[model samples]
Target: GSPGIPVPGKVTLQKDAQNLIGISIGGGAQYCPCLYIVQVFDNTPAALDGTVAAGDEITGVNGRSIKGKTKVEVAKMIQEVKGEVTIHYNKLQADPKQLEVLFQGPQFTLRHWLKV
Candidate 1:
């Protein structure tokens, strides 16, 4: 219970050759209250900025709220907007309570690899 509240932040990233910013996201809609970043790959637009970290909840993207959307839907939202993209998030710092069921207990770490 050390966490008082999460801080909100935003990041603007330019898409790569493959139109990906290199940030993995999960936990949205039916699974969790908000969509959160799962990981940030190195050597990408998001990684270069280094502001959007893992466990940060994304409230909006491109100035549009993403509430009640599936992770895949959210991905589509990002993909639709080519070149520069904006990500709005809340820093959780893995507060234990909010991060514990980040993926319904983290039974396995299944990662999604963008198709080439």
Candidate 2:
């Protein structure tokens, strides 16, 4: 299967009392080569915004880019901010091949019905 396409998008969220946006991160430079969202927790700032999604790549925080940074470092960058946090991300979307539906004719279905 082909990889997803990156659609650039942005989001702003407010951190909770624990200074959390209620999301997880995974994949980084050197090995993974990209910073992608692992999970977007429910009922949180991100979830409330209804924009951030799992499998999306976060390119920057506020106005600072996160190129060549690890997940740990990005976490710090986000945490260092106060209540407001803005994210620039590339939305990931999976494209499905147009495999036309078969079995329109009854013969194609009955041809394989013979017992072996």
Candidate 3:
């Protein structure tokens, strides 16, 4: 219902986002028909950049669980970025919301960079 953390276009790379790949088999019914991606960002230069890609089943965020996350909700995460992000995806599938998340982070806070 609220916005997520932020990341910068100049500081981070969406294309270069680090991610993992795997098959999630809990061996049960009710398996999702969707995918997830974790949008990660730089917290410390010495720290690893976050990651989000195909085959990575999302279970949480910043501490929130992704058990029932919707397509829009997942995309919303990308919409608001400031510094770094971690996108968790399900099957390397294409998500349009991912694009929105990629550019909007710093764009929202860019006004501070100006000297008016």
Candidate 4:
């Protein structure tokens, strides 16, 4: 079967006590064993990066295959990572091919943005 939406995203973090991508994961079945992103913590690196979203499934980490691994195993792998870490993922409900990027030109000034 042809691939759905191939969404490849990554998040890098420095090795520290609170080194976290700040994303909650869920999903594990016999056919679909990849971990799905359920939640993203606010003010964290993952949230600030604005790349990963809720409905995204992790396919690999640091160039290593993680599919078919249990949640506990993935957690342990994350915890063991040091220095640089990369998370490769795929979006569940978005079609990257159909998604269009509209360039609205560069910003003339860095204005103070207000939160909605």
Could you estimate the TM-score for every candidate?
Answer: 0.67, 0.62, 0.30, 0.57
The candidate scoring highest on lDDT is 1
Q: How much does candidate 2 score in TM-score?
A: 0.62
Candidate 3 lDDT tens digits, 1-116: 32342331112323223221111211112222222322223332212343333223444433344445544453344334433334332332335665333323332222111000
| Candidate 4 to truth, TM | 0.57
Better of 2 and 4 by lDDT: 2
What is the C-alpha local distance difference test score of each model?
0.63, 0.56, 0.30, 0.51
lDDT of 1 by residue, 1-116 (tens): 12243787787877777787777766542344444566676677776774665556766777776655666777788888977778877755555675655534553545452210
Candidates, ranked, TM-score: 1, 2, 4, 3
Better of 1 and 3 by TM-score: 1
> What tens-digit string does per-residue lDDT give for candidate 2 at 22-80?
77755432223343554676677766674565545666677676655655677778788
1 against 2, candidate with superior TM-score: 1
Comparing 3 and 4 on TM-score, the stronger one: 4
Least well predicted 10-residue stretch by lDDT in candidate 1: 107-116
List pairs with backbone clashes in candidate 4: none
Error of 1 at 69 (Å): 2.5
Candidate 2 local lDDT, residue 101: 16
